[PDB]
Amino acid sequence: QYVAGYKVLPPLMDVNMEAAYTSSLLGSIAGVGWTAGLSSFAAIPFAQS
Amino acid sequence: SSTMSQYSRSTRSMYGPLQTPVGCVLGLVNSSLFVEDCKLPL
Ligand SMILES: *[C@@H]1O[C@H](CO)[C@@H](O)[C@H](O)[C@H]1NC(C)=O
């Protein structure tokens, strides 16, 4: 990379940040899946979802 | 600061090179706060 200055910008979140993003969507897949819109939450037992 | 090249120094050195996961910064100062709306991505 340095041989002709091939600087790679790291993604502007550290790996843990989109890890927590994936965590949030993994917690909310059931949490959205009962009613249209993004108003309430639906943290139902996942098997019931 | 020893072995430089290109143009001159952009240095206002007076306090510690901060060690970061993105390397090390001259000019910043260590702190631990929280910002959810960052405008300068380092
Ligand atoms: C700030 O100080 C803490 C305490 O040792 C250290 O863990 C951290 O890496 C420091 N951060 C920077 C940017 O110097």
Side-chain angles (χ1 to χ4, degrees), chain A residues 23-35 40-49:
Chain A
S23 311
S24 58
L25 59 89
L26 188 153
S28 63
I29 42 174
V32 186
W34 211 352
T35 310
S40 68
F41 207 54
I44 314 303
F46 181 73
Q48 190 174 186
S49 68

Side-chain angles (χ1 to χ4, degrees), chain B residues 16-21 25 28-32:
Chain B
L18 288 192
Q19 275 306 136
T20 65
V25 184
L28 271 172
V29 58
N30 197 353
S31 71
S32 198

Side-chain angles (χ1 to χ4, degrees), chain A residues 2-45:
Chain A
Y2 182 78
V3 171
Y6 284 30
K7 200 265 162 189
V8 192
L9 275 296
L12 294 175
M13 301 66 87
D14 184 20
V15 194
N16 314 139
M17 187 66 203
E18 72 285 358
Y21 268 108
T22 49
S23 311
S24 58
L25 59 89
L26 188 153
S28 63
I29 42 174
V32 186
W34 211 352
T35 310
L38 309 179
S39 304
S40 68
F41 207 54
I44 314 303

